[PDB]
Amino acid sequence: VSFSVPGLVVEDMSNSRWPAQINGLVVRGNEAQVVHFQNGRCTTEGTLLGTTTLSINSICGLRGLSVSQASVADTTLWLRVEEPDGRPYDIFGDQPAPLGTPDFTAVIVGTAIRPRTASGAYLHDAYVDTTPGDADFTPSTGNTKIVLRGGGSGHVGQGHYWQFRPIAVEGGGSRPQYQEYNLPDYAGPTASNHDLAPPVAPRMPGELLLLFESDMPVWDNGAGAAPAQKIHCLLPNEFITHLFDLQAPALAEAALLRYVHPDSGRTLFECKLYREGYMVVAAPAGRLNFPLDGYFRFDSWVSAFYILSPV
Amino acid sequence: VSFSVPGLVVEDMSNSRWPAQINGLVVRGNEAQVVHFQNGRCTTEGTLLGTTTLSINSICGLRGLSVSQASVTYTLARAADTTLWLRVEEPDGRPYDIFGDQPAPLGTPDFTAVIVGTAIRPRTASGAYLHDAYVDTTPGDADFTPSTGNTKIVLRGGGSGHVGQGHYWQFRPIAVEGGGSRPQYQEYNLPDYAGPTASNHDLAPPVAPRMPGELLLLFESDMPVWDNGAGAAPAQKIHCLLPNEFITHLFDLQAPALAEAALLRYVHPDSGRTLFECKLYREGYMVVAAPAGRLNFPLDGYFRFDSWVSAFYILSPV
């Protein structure tokens, strides 16, 4: 099985850590906080890592059956968390958390949805605090908490299927900071993480990480004063499904890709997609100034010692 | 270039008319209302039709720059609302061509209902903003007019002072209204894209199986319902001809059709065999030799292409 990458242009593709179109290409330096994404992790061989799911609608979310408090103004909701396919989450399995679980610290605003109940369907505005400031973000233990904002009393009875779907993160002066590079405590304050997908840092000199950018919406209680935000991922969802389906064996540490712009009738730049599923370019940190209507094309397998032409 | 379909299991794939995982397979009969979807339209050769976009996050939504009004019980709750006016554009940010080959901008909602969601103003230098919102796509609202280059978004209960012109906005769908005396959600009913005054144009063609004993196979998802926190409205579904992963697969592949339909087999790894077979017609829909109603098969199986066949090929019953 010969290797290949999707022929879709970048602005057609989507973020694998957040529900959004890709609208930017940026190069990140080797900052103190190392990239440790749990979502959007796929090898060139199509091996999924961390909490990565192929179900785009399950990304950065929680779903499962409601349960009572004792079994574990606003209204609290308790879920026994499960996988996107509906099968139960394996506590002592090979994952730090259920697939699609948020992989960063913030207060995440969104909707709590109870779609199938015979007594009638329900939804309400909700938020999930994934910072260590909240003791009850514990999806690694099999249960987690969701807060229904301003209402929801009488609707959180046990035995019903719920979903939390993300809309935005909180911003503003006295709200918890949104830190997309900061991994949460999946097991809460009392316990440790396990089976995390490995850190991403370029080994070779002169090679920096290339990230796919999206806008990150911000909630500030209707003020409209909080500063605009971004969120990033190693590979687009369309890349991940392509590789997973293909299951092509890696023939070298990296695949040399060229970014091809039909209008310009030429290649604009080239990059290295490493076996571990991240891209690098010989370029300094910061936003790349290229049109997003170009696509990546695979040309050959190269070693880690291959010297890229500057961007 | 040989034809093929994705090897992904069904419960891994997503709906091309709504933001949701696929969780059902159902067979629809030839009802009075013919399937006329504008989103989720792709031929087996990878030709996109209607308002179909490859950007899954732009599906059933509206985006563009804000504009002034001059540029363009129920009554009580309405007074508390704020209207937002957008000059609609494509997902890539390029302007909508009013006299182009589309009934509306790509990703526009293709059914009549009140759609609840979020109005997002994500990049403004003065600070980012969002608010709870709804879009009335029924002929009951004169101002759903995306075909004309402008449409309306209603901010529920607030938003005054935030709807100034010149800023980038998005409307993203969360649910449809379902309350007792609220507009009906009718996923098979095409909206008036130009409003009451003008007619639609360049609609993707109707879908109805020609061959006898063949009914349409649809991919089902849950549809969330908003009823102002009552929780009494009955549960809903939404359907599509092909999953998003099918559409991107065909678009990238660009394989020429060698016959009227592609014979697909549904393969279940645990059972170690094919469970049923179907026909994927060139026009981009699937059919099966089966009566109407929900199919009872596990969703951890995948479709596999076996050969090109004519419309007269007789499928084995499901």
XYZ file of C-alpha atoms in Angstrom:
629
model
C 0.000 0.000 0.000
C 1.631 3.190 -1.283
C 1.472 6.286 0.926
C -0.434 9.458 0.054
C -2.033 12.520 1.657
C -5.418 14.109 0.872
C -5.667 16.404 -2.149
C -8.045 18.763 -0.368
C -7.112 22.438 -0.037
C -6.457 23.673 3.502
C -9.465 25.996 3.897
C -11.679 22.999 3.043
C -10.356 21.005 6.015
C -11.198 20.951 9.731
C -9.549 21.156 13.183
C -9.119 17.858 15.065
C -9.202 19.445 18.528
C -12.114 21.857 18.095
C -15.219 22.243 15.892
C -13.882 24.700 13.294
C -12.640 25.168 9.727
C -8.876 25.710 9.334
C -8.191 29.395 8.619
C -4.473 29.691 9.376
C -1.031 28.149 9.045
C 1.475 28.980 11.791
C 4.949 27.894 12.851
C 5.564 27.349 16.568
C 8.947 27.526 18.282
C 10.261 25.328 21.098
C 8.499 27.122 23.960
C 8.659 26.015 27.596
C 5.225 24.394 27.312
C 5.653 21.386 25.038
C 2.887 20.348 22.635
C 1.125 17.384 24.274
C -2.137 17.057 22.330
C -4.358 14.068 23.100
C -6.772 14.757 20.245
C -5.672 15.058 16.617
C -3.009 12.379 16.960
C -2.434 10.016 14.036
C 0.696 8.355 12.682
C 1.462 8.208 8.963
C 0.606 4.521 9.281
C -2.903 5.408 10.435
C -2.394 4.445 14.073
C -4.519 6.540 16.435
C -3.079 7.763 19.749
C -4.305 9.474 22.912
C -8.032 10.199 22.852
C -8.306 10.587 19.085
C -11.609 9.660 17.451
C -12.711 9.621 13.822
C -16.113 11.012 14.828
C -15.659 14.748 14.235
C -18.801 15.608 16.179
C -17.422 13.876 19.286
C -14.307 16.039 19.422
C -13.713 17.991 22.652
C -16.934 16.672 24.183
C -18.457 14.348 26.781
C -21.326 11.881 26.437
C -23.055 9.139 28.441
C -25.813 8.148 30.884
C -26.893 10.425 33.746
C -26.362 9.222 37.339
C -27.164 10.401 40.891
C -24.737 12.459 43.014
C -24.476 9.904 45.824
C -23.520 7.192 43.333
C -20.331 9.139 42.614
C -29.040 29.111 40.388
C -27.184 26.318 38.595
C -27.937 22.594 38.400
C -25.321 19.823 38.499
C -25.367 16.883 36.080
C -23.403 13.670 36.603
C -22.511 11.367 33.722
C -21.071 7.890 33.583
C -18.832 8.608 30.607
C -18.677 6.312 27.571
C -17.151 6.137 24.066
C -18.647 7.806 20.932
C -19.890 4.474 19.514
C -21.885 4.005 22.735
C -19.706 1.198 24.095
C -18.519 1.708 27.707
C -15.217 3.393 28.585
C -12.504 0.975 29.742
C -11.034 2.475 32.925
C -7.859 0.382 32.845
C -7.425 0.501 29.077
C -4.889 2.205 26.810
C -6.414 5.701 26.943
C -6.027 8.642 29.358
C -9.759 9.311 28.973
C -12.697 8.539 26.676
C -12.144 9.434 23.027
C -12.921 13.051 22.178
C -12.383 14.223 25.772
C -11.086 17.824 25.983
C -7.273 17.952 26.081
C -6.761 21.412 27.584
C -7.541 23.540 30.645
C -10.289 26.164 30.504
C -13.938 26.653 31.241
C -15.650 25.312 28.148
C -19.047 26.751 27.307
C -21.487 24.606 25.343
C -24.812 22.793 25.284
C -25.956 19.884 27.417
C -28.201 17.772 25.183
C -30.595 14.974 26.155
C -31.887 13.958 22.692
C -33.694 10.589 22.981
C -35.861 10.624 26.138
C -39.401 9.266 25.678
C -40.747 11.835 28.152
C -39.432 14.450 25.729
C -36.165 15.877 24.422
C -34.198 18.466 26.394
C -31.229 20.830 26.178
C -29.769 23.665 28.262
C -26.825 26.086 28.323
C -23.911 24.500 30.184
C -20.213 24.677 31.011
C -17.372 22.302 31.930
C -14.427 23.398 34.089
C -11.360 21.421 32.988
C -8.819 23.327 35.095
C -7.322 21.864 38.292
C -9.363 24.514 40.109
C -12.292 22.117 39.793
C -11.957 18.812 41.639
C -14.802 17.191 39.680
C -13.337 16.961 36.174
C -12.587 13.250 36.491
C -13.434 11.429 33.238
C -10.507 9.052 33.858
C -12.434 7.586 36.815
C -15.530 6.876 34.717
C -17.603 9.786 35.992
C -17.520 13.517 35.324
C -19.581 16.595 36.147
C -21.411 19.034 33.873
C -22.923 22.286 35.125
C -26.216 23.505 33.713
C -25.976 27.299 33.808
C -28.875 29.146 35.432
C -31.377 26.294 35.334
C -32.101 22.634 34.652
C -33.569 21.514 37.976
C -35.729 18.408 37.629
C -34.203 17.327 34.314
C -31.034 15.618 35.568
C -32.523 12.293 36.665
C -30.510 9.094 36.281
C -30.623 6.619 33.401
C -30.702 8.939 30.370
C -28.296 9.633 27.501
C -26.629 13.048 27.518
C -24.087 14.877 25.375
C -22.016 17.977 26.067
C -21.140 19.789 22.843
C -18.593 22.667 22.891
C -19.358 26.170 21.631
C -16.610 28.319 23.188
C -14.169 28.894 26.071
C -14.546 31.492 28.826
C -12.552 34.716 28.785
C -12.586 37.909 30.819
C -10.998 39.317 33.942
C -12.102 36.995 36.728
C -12.603 33.798 34.743
C -10.234 30.807 34.444
C -7.594 31.187 31.718
C -7.864 29.273 28.458
C -4.566 27.447 27.928
C -4.715 25.171 24.888
C -1.245 23.718 25.525
C -1.943 22.788 29.176
C -3.106 19.192 29.678
C -5.865 18.721 32.296
C -5.932 16.269 35.207
C -8.168 13.573 33.729
C -8.302 11.739 37.064
C -8.730 14.922 39.098
C -6.528 16.315 41.922
C -6.227 13.021 43.844
C -4.781 10.863 41.040
C -2.451 10.845 38.013
C -2.844 10.581 34.221
C -1.877 7.436 32.282
C -1.333 6.288 28.672
C -0.934 9.860 27.376
C 0.106 10.247 23.745
C 3.804 11.270 23.535
C 5.024 14.916 23.461
C 5.684 16.610 20.124
C 9.022 18.392 19.715
C 11.159 18.537 16.555
C 14.552 16.875 17.034
C 16.352 18.116 13.923
C 18.024 21.560 13.983
C 16.380 24.301 11.924
C 13.073 22.433 11.870
C 10.086 23.964 13.630
C 6.586 22.640 14.162
C 3.837 23.619 11.712
C 0.361 23.979 13.211
C -3.106 24.309 11.649
C -5.001 27.292 13.092
C -8.691 27.923 13.758
C -10.619 30.691 15.519
C -11.634 30.036 19.127
C -14.960 31.610 20.180
C -15.072 33.423 23.526
C -17.878 33.729 26.093
C -17.877 36.652 28.538
C -21.490 36.863 29.724
C -22.508 39.110 26.832
C -19.887 41.791 27.489
C -18.016 41.377 24.207
C -14.817 42.762 25.744
C -12.652 39.624 26.095
C -9.771 39.247 23.591
C -10.091 36.945 20.567
C -8.538 33.483 20.795
C -7.134 30.706 18.598
C -6.767 26.924 18.780
C -4.378 24.638 16.901
C -3.879 21.016 15.832
C -1.135 18.858 14.318
C -3.217 17.484 11.428
C -6.676 18.166 9.961
C -9.463 15.596 10.466
C -9.413 14.841 6.755
C -5.738 13.904 7.070
C -6.464 11.562 9.981
C -9.374 9.674 8.355
C -7.307 9.393 5.166
C -4.340 7.811 6.952
C -6.492 5.560 9.174
C -8.295 4.178 6.123
C -5.104 3.817 4.064
C -3.000 1.934 6.662
C 0.158 2.455 4.608
C 3.504 1.349 6.105
C 6.111 4.045 6.761
C 9.197 3.562 4.593
C 11.252 6.291 6.277
C 11.069 8.640 9.258
C 9.250 11.257 7.194
C 7.349 11.872 3.987
C 8.373 14.909 1.950
C 5.272 16.926 1.084
C 4.935 19.900 -1.247
C 2.334 22.617 -0.830
C 0.946 23.203 -4.302
C -0.989 26.275 -5.426
C -2.904 25.769 -8.712
C -3.268 29.514 -9.350
C 0.485 30.148 -9.016
C 1.113 27.086 -11.185
C 3.865 25.938 -8.831
C 4.901 24.662 -5.413
C 5.034 27.419 -2.783
C 6.833 25.527 -0.025
C 7.711 22.034 1.183
C 7.513 20.327 4.569
C 8.338 17.110 6.418
C 5.534 14.968 7.853
C 7.170 12.733 10.449
C 6.098 9.169 11.147
C 4.702 10.209 14.534
C 2.149 12.418 12.762
C 3.381 16.014 12.893
C 4.708 18.388 10.210
C 7.828 20.592 10.317
C 9.281 23.388 8.162
C 12.605 25.216 7.961
C 11.150 28.586 8.976
C 11.063 30.909 11.994
C 8.125 31.046 14.415
C 4.984 33.001 13.490
C 2.107 33.104 11.008
C 2.791 31.856 7.477
C 1.518 34.190 4.760
C 0.177 31.778 2.141
C -3.238 31.396 0.480
C -5.296 28.577 1.979
C -6.536 27.275 -1.384
C -3.517 25.024 -1.886
C -3.068 21.326 -1.108
C -0.300 19.055 0.173
C 1.108 16.408 -2.169
C 3.382 13.497 -1.267
C 6.488 13.154 -3.455
C 8.939 10.783 -1.702
C 10.110 9.176 1.549
C 13.068 10.971 3.160
C 15.232 10.556 6.261
C 15.306 12.814 9.319
C 18.645 14.112 8.021
C 17.013 15.447 4.850
C 17.533 19.200 4.605
C 14.372 21.149 3.752
C 14.405 24.205 1.496
C 13.546 27.355 3.518
C 9.941 28.601 3.497
C -8.400 5.712 -11.730
C -10.519 3.007 -10.052
C -13.643 3.820 -8.044
C -13.822 3.077 -4.303
C -15.725 4.040 -1.154
C -14.320 4.765 2.340
C -13.538 1.810 4.605
C -14.763 3.625 7.706
C -17.438 2.039 9.919
C -20.816 3.796 9.894
C -20.829 4.901 13.545
C -17.495 6.642 12.841
C -18.974 8.828 10.100
C -20.905 12.106 10.138
C -24.115 13.628 8.715
C -23.749 16.007 5.721
C -26.828 18.117 6.488
C -26.390 18.539 10.247
C -23.569 18.476 12.836
C -23.969 14.917 14.147
C -22.554 11.405 14.162
C -24.475 8.784 12.213
C -26.380 6.530 14.624
C -29.007 4.959 12.356
C -29.786 3.353 9.018
C -33.370 3.677 7.741
C -35.185 2.940 4.475
C -37.629 5.577 3.203
C -40.525 4.865 0.865
C -41.796 7.024 -1.990
C -43.799 9.469 0.116
C -45.582 12.521 -1.293
C -42.677 14.781 -0.337
C -39.759 13.874 -2.597
C -36.216 14.057 -1.198
C -34.766 17.362 -2.403
C -31.681 17.898 -0.222
C -29.363 20.757 -1.184
C -26.607 19.853 1.299
C -24.970 16.418 1.233
C -25.065 16.220 -2.565
C -22.186 14.509 -4.359
C -22.012 12.276 -7.431
C -19.902 9.116 -7.511
C -17.550 11.035 -9.791
C -16.993 13.644 -7.088
C -19.116 16.443 -8.551
C -20.641 18.653 -5.857
C -24.217 19.921 -6.307
C -26.654 22.331 -4.668
C -25.137 24.124 -1.685
C -22.757 21.318 -0.700
C -19.444 22.232 0.933
C -16.489 20.105 2.034
C -16.153 22.233 5.165
C -18.102 20.154 7.677
C -18.162 23.019 10.204
C -19.933 25.298 7.693
C -22.853 22.901 7.188
C -26.367 24.268 7.878
C -25.018 27.681 8.881
C -24.626 31.308 7.799
C -21.573 33.589 7.821
C -20.484 36.989 6.503
C -19.998 40.679 7.251
C -22.573 42.603 9.267
C -24.461 45.372 7.485
C -26.948 48.088 8.411
C -30.712 47.666 8.024
C -30.862 50.412 5.380
C -28.410 48.378 3.283
C -31.041 45.658 2.906
C -46.371 36.105 24.003
C -44.476 35.622 20.753
C -44.790 39.366 20.222
C -43.648 40.089 23.792
C -40.570 37.849 23.704
C -39.795 39.278 20.248
C -39.495 42.850 21.524
C -36.637 41.734 23.772
C -34.730 40.358 20.772
C -32.148 42.045 18.529
C -31.885 41.569 14.756
C -28.532 41.126 13.009
C -28.082 41.638 9.264
C -25.391 39.821 7.273
C -23.999 40.084 3.765
C -23.572 36.358 3.192
C -20.402 34.791 1.787
C -18.841 31.382 1.038
C -16.961 29.289 3.650
C -13.587 30.202 2.139
C -14.501 33.869 2.677
C -15.004 34.676 -1.007
C -18.195 36.624 -1.873
C -21.436 34.867 -2.792
C -22.156 35.033 -6.514
C -25.831 36.003 -6.653
C -26.161 35.008 -10.316
C -24.066 31.850 -10.031
C -24.822 28.114 -10.144
C -26.079 27.835 -6.566
C -29.528 28.298 -4.921
C -27.766 29.924 -1.947
C -24.293 30.177 -0.409
C -22.723 26.761 0.261
C -23.689 25.238 3.606
C -27.002 27.104 3.806
C -29.808 25.232 5.658
C -31.901 23.156 3.215
C -35.114 22.713 5.248
C -37.904 24.717 6.891
C -37.915 25.222 10.671
C -36.754 27.564 13.369
C -33.108 26.716 13.898
C -31.606 27.550 17.281
C -27.866 28.197 17.513
C -25.084 30.634 18.337
C -24.251 33.962 16.688
C -20.476 34.361 16.842
C -18.359 37.445 16.224
C -14.938 35.828 16.715
C -12.171 38.175 15.455
C -13.186 41.767 16.349
C -10.342 43.894 17.756
C -12.702 45.555 20.245
C -13.224 42.103 21.757
C -14.860 38.809 20.839
C -18.603 38.339 21.196
C -21.319 35.684 21.043
C -25.015 35.396 21.857
C -27.875 32.901 21.792
C -29.729 33.136 18.469
C -32.260 31.647 16.044
C -32.969 31.678 12.305
C -36.520 31.258 10.981
C -36.284 29.469 7.636
C -40.029 28.968 7.091
C -42.042 30.999 4.569
C -43.574 32.542 7.693
C -40.507 34.792 7.871
C -40.048 37.207 4.973
C -36.413 37.950 5.873
C -34.793 34.560 5.248
C -33.371 35.629 1.895
C -29.825 34.274 1.471
C -30.301 34.043 -2.308
C -30.407 37.850 -2.470
C -27.052 38.312 -0.738
C -28.460 39.322 2.647
C -30.189 37.378 5.428
C -31.335 37.963 9.005
C -30.222 36.488 12.325
C -32.195 37.130 15.499
C -30.336 37.491 18.781
C -32.612 36.133 21.505
C -33.141 38.441 24.476
C -30.182 40.738 23.837
C -27.339 41.843 21.590
C -28.081 45.555 21.354
C -24.952 47.622 20.749
C -23.049 44.647 19.361
C -24.579 44.438 15.885
C -22.670 47.253 14.158
C -21.651 46.967 10.505
C -18.313 45.798 9.123
C -17.623 42.783 11.346
C -17.358 39.056 10.593
C -20.184 36.889 11.953
C -21.148 33.212 11.999
C -24.377 31.371 12.751
C -23.795 27.778 13.952
C -26.703 25.304 14.432
C -27.430 23.597 17.771
C -31.086 22.525 17.494
C -34.560 23.156 16.037
C -37.575 24.521 17.922
C -40.283 21.988 18.780
C -42.672 23.615 21.239
C -46.428 23.129 21.018
C -47.386 26.277 19.113
C -44.003 26.740 17.423
C -43.150 26.308 13.728
C -42.907 22.695 12.556
C -39.538 21.148 11.795
C -39.794 19.599 8.333
C -36.442 18.301 7.114
C -37.849 17.332 3.706
C -39.336 20.769 2.974
C -37.105 23.085 0.921
C -37.079 26.741 2.039
C -37.632 29.836 -0.075
C -34.025 30.992 -0.446
C -35.037 34.296 -2.064
C -37.958 34.835 0.287
C -41.620 35.252 -0.802
C -40.908 37.789 -3.570
C -38.711 35.654 -5.848
C -38.147 32.053 -6.929
C -35.371 29.556 -6.213
C -32.879 28.598 -8.916
C -30.180 26.000 -9.625
C -31.539 23.502 -7.078
C -29.877 20.089 -7.058
C -32.245 17.532 -8.681
C -34.924 15.551 -6.752
C -34.079 12.074 -5.474
C -36.466 9.224 -6.224
C -35.549 5.623 -7.102
C -36.694 4.639 -10.607
C -36.367 0.843 -10.384
C -39.169 -1.321 -8.907
C -38.515 -2.904 -5.513
C -35.801 -0.353 -4.706
C -36.259 2.162 -1.872
C -33.961 4.941 -0.628
C -31.387 4.214 2.074
C -30.769 7.140 4.422
C -28.179 7.795 7.120
C -29.864 8.886 10.359
C -28.716 11.175 13.181
C -30.378 12.546 16.318
C -31.838 16.046 16.044
C -31.759 18.134 19.240
C -34.937 20.010 20.128
C -35.361 23.373 21.852
C -38.609 24.100 23.705
C -37.586 26.926 26.049
C -36.469 24.535 28.792
C -39.757 22.645 29.023
C -38.321 19.314 27.890
C -41.708 18.120 26.631
C -41.316 18.268 22.838
C -40.998 14.907 21.049
C -37.582 13.697 19.876
C -36.471 14.297 16.288
C -34.144 12.883 13.635
C -32.309 14.182 10.573
C -31.148 12.302 7.467
C -28.646 12.544 4.605
C -27.862 10.729 1.340
C -24.174 10.147 2.079
C -21.850 10.729 5.069
C -19.295 13.570 4.879
C -16.405 11.110 4.666
C -18.018 9.587 1.565
C -18.255 13.017 -0.086
C -14.617 14.051 0.579
C -13.498 10.591 -0.573
C -15.315 10.871 -3.908
C -14.306 14.531 -4.445
C -10.586 13.774 -4.014
C -10.790 10.583 -6.110
C -12.619 11.996 -9.166
C -13.248 8.529 -10.616
C -15.329 8.284 -13.817
C -18.579 6.313 -13.566
C -18.492 3.167 -15.703
C -22.140 2.253 -15.143
C -25.381 3.602 -13.702
C -24.623 2.317 -10.202
C -21.898 0.880 -7.996
C -22.715 -2.338 -6.164
C -21.673 -2.034 -2.525
C -21.522 -4.690 0.175
C -21.885 -3.953 3.873
C -19.214 -5.946 5.692
C -19.287 -6.788 9.394
C -15.855 -7.958 10.691
C -17.183 -9.650 13.853
C -19.738 -11.705 11.898
C -17.049 -12.393 9.302
C -19.447 -11.798 6.414
C -21.591 -9.446 4.346
C -24.886 -8.525 6.055
C -26.648 -6.814 3.152
C -25.941 -5.177 -0.194
C -27.009 -1.909 -1.805
C -26.709 0.118 -5.006
C -24.967 3.500 -5.045
C -26.332 5.308 -8.090
C -24.142 7.764 -10.000
C -26.350 10.633 -8.863
C -25.086 10.032 -5.330
C -27.727 8.138 -3.372
C -28.006 4.554 -2.067
C -30.977 2.168 -2.434
C -31.853 -1.310 -1.115
C -34.355 -4.050 -1.941
C -36.215 -3.639 1.344
C -39.487 -2.271 2.763
C -39.627 1.117 4.489
C -38.445 1.472 8.087
C -35.370 1.207 10.304
C -32.672 -1.325 9.403
C -31.535 -3.445 12.367
C -27.803 -3.881 11.773
C -24.740 -3.065 13.918
C -23.057 0.187 12.876
C -19.523 -1.149 13.251
C -19.549 -2.415 9.672
C -18.283 -0.773 6.474
C -19.304 -0.439 2.817
C -17.031 -2.004 0.204
C -17.188 -1.465 -3.569
C -17.286 -4.671 -5.622
C -18.342 -3.836 -9.205
C -20.160 -1.496 -11.578
C -23.680 -2.677 -12.463
C -26.625 -1.459 -14.540
C -29.901 -0.129 -13.150
C -31.453 -3.497 -14.024
C -29.206 -5.399 -11.608
C -31.425 -7.151 -9.065
C -30.355 -6.674 -5.451
C -30.709 -9.438 -2.876
C -33.361 -8.464 -0.295
C -32.169 -7.001 2.998
